[PDB]
């Protein structure tokens, strides 16, 4: 898969010269609009829509699509503004479309954005079900971009607790759990399809409020890659105490996926991470906990690169 | 299909209040960024990709995707800036991806834009081939939006000649012509799959040059809807002399599709239309003909709404 994709990525990178010394030049991708940067991001829901089809429950899949886009905008400090959607279907089912629209409205409400357009394509010779994707745009001032460059040792890492499972980990979870257990298996009070369909969490409001009130050095959406999303932020290392394995991640880990790979695939209870100075710890926790449960995770340390999960004995 | 889609469109319109008195408020969709409007548009290639799969020729389908997006941006006078793509595949074929990338590069070159991101989703339980879509953003100053409000009677309509077929008409053309004739049928020097796969034309450069040099009252991308795209521009009517039926449109019209519906579905030889004052006619034709063959079509007339195609005896 990776080999084929490099062709598209390499071709797109050659088009950057077409905006040289022009408005909107690229430099989330960040577009130079002189007065600000325009952040742009693109993501689909993936195979989580297969669980939605299996149980005829589509009213939260639009929350997932919006969440994957707007959470990647706030990574760089951008305020999400608008989103356009791409919906490709085999057949136009009125009742499914009304379900999808409810999740799109609620997701746009939490993210504080407007859904300003999109395309619905009925292609039964092409799609065998439902495919939902989207593109989001945000705005960030040029001196407010959160790059992670200001992350220094002794900075504190704070995690905001997650909700649902992302697309990459959901492929492994479906493939590992559905044949053995079935979608109707009850695990720890929730049926398996509920664990797999539960929408991911939208972090726009607590993060925008945090950035407005607190000195922030780093922002990481814990999506595909797990703690690897934290590693790309800085050349320094981390020393974390991740929360106990719990929920659906306990069942997956019980079913043979090694610890080292769990933290590289799933969010493991933390959906978003912030990095503030030592002194801002209590300010930051107090703001974020108005919204979701947030908690101290670890610190930035001097030994470069590696992430050391103390209470597990894992290194990434 | 229409009934189901209204649910998504009505839900998206309710989210507009979420940007009230905020940056990027909606008002192509146009986003109020104070210093300018950001135009945003979304479109996929549709079933033209089925012809590409049938003949293993994917090196122009990316031209189509970019053309459908950037031609809808310049409709309002916006300069296209960037594009992100959504590619959903059954299998990641390296050779097909290298083909697609060539068309994306060449299309971005003609449109003068950068491809700044996107998502490729390998979902074999979801796609049975290839699905290519995209979103484009452009910029237009607030006092430069071409709305069509300045269109008045005696204004001259100029058409820029088209290239290929759009997605809506391609569905009718495949369905009408492929069973009777086969993709290998030679019609007027080109095989049928070549008529159906030929990319649509990118009009960014001649239109941007026109808007910079000439007083322009109206801009219409002749896409899905045919001459109906001209009708939405103004409450006044039109009196046109469309070019003779020719090329693949001759074979379709020979195969039973009525004249009135041809001008409502296909581009009929004109891919883009501009409306300038009477006095600008020769200035405008001289600029556009540096790029593609452009020609006088008709005029705006006083009798409201209806489009009268003189040399056919059709009214729309
Ligand atoms: Cl997400
Ligand atoms: Cl996850
Ligand atoms: Cl087009
Ligand atoms: Cl057409
Ligand atoms: Zn530059
Ligand atoms: Zn994704
Ligand atoms: Zn993402
Ligand atoms: Zn009904
Ligand atoms: Zn400043
Ligand atoms: Zn600082
Ligand atoms: Zn997430
Ligand atoms: Zn101090
Ligand atoms: Zn402080
Ligand atoms: Zn205190
Ligand atoms: Zn307003
Ligand atoms: Zn379309
Ligand atoms: Zn279009
Ligand atoms: Zn190879
Ligand atoms: Zn001005
Ligand atoms: Zn004028
Ligand atoms: Zn076109
Ligand atoms: Zn004069
Ligand atoms: Zn003049
Ligand atoms: Zn002259």
From Swiss-Prot, chains A, B:
One of its GO terms (biological process) is 'de novo' IMP biosynthetic process. Its EC number is 6.3.3.1. It holds the Pfam family AIRS_C. It is found in: Cytoplasm. Pathway: Purine metabolism; IMP biosynthesis via de novo pathway; 5-amino-1-(5-phospho-D-ribosyl)imidazole from N(2)-formyl-N(1)-(5-phospho-D-ribosyl)glycinamide: step 2/2. SUPFAM superfamilies: PurM C-terminal domain-like, PurM N-terminal domain-like. Gene3D superfamilies: PurM-like C-terminal domain, PurM-like, N-terminal domain. It comes from the Archaea. Keywords: ATP-binding, Cytoplasm, Ligase, Nucleotide-binding, Purine biosynthesis. GO terms for molecular function: ATP binding; phosphoribosylamine-glycine ligase activity; phosphoribosylformylglycinamidine cyclo-ligase activity. Transmembrane segments: none annotated. It catalyses: 2-formamido-N(1)-(5-O-phospho-beta-D-ribosyl)acetamidine + ATP = 5-amino-1-(5-phospho-beta-D-ribosyl)imidazole + ADP + phosphate + H(+). Belongs to the AIR synthase family. HAMAP family: AIRS. PANTHER family: TRIFUNCTIONAL PURINE BIOSYNTHETIC PROTEIN ADENOSINE-3, TRIFUNCTIONAL PURINE BIOSYNTHETIC PROTEIN ADENOSINE-3-RELATED. This is Phosphoribosylformylglycinamidine cyclo-ligase. It comes from Pyrococcus horikoshii (strain ATCC 700860 / DSM 12428 / JCM 9974 / NBRC 100139 / OT-3).
């Amino acid at each position: 898969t990776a080999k084929a994709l490099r062709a598209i990525i390499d071709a797109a990178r050659r088009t950057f010269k077409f905006r040289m010394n022009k408005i909107g030049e690229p430099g989330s991708a960040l577009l130079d609009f002189k007065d600000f940067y325009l952040a742009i991001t693109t993501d689909g829901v993936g195979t989580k829509i297969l669980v939605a089809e299996a149980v005829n429950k589509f009213d939260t899949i639009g929350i997932d699509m919006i969440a994957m886009n707007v959470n990647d905008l706030i990574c760089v400090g951008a305020e999400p503004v608008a989103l356009v959607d791409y919906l490709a279907v085999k057949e136009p089912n009125e009742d499914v479309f009304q379900q999808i629209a409810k999740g799109l409205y609620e997701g746009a409400k939490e993210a504080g954005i407007a859904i300003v357009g999109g395309e619905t394509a009925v292609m039964p010779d092409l799609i065998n079900g439902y495919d939902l994707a989207g593109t989001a745009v945000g705005i960030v001032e040029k001196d407010k971009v959160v790059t992670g460059e200001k992350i220094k040792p002794d900075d504190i890492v704070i995690g905001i607790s997650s909700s649902g499972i992302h697309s990459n980990g959901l492929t492994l979870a479906r493939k590992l759990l559905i044949p053995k257990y079935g979608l109707d298996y009850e695990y720890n009070g929730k049926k398996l399809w509920e664990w797999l369909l539960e929408p991911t969490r939208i972090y726009v409001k607590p993060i925008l409020k945090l950035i407005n009130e607190v000195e922030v050095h780093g922002l990481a959406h814990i999506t595909g890659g797990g703690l690897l999303n934290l590693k790309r932020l800085t050349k320094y290392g981390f020393e974390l105490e991740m929360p106990p394995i719990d929920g659906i991640f306990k069942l997956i880990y019980e079913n043979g996926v090694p610890l080292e790979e769990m933290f590289r695939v799933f969010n493991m209870g933390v959906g978003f991470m912030v990095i503030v100075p030592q002194e801002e710890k209590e300010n930051a926790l107090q703001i974020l906990n108005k919204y979701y449960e947030s908690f101290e995770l670890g610190k930035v340390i001097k030994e470069p690169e590696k992430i050391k999960v103390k209470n597990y004995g894992i290194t990434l």
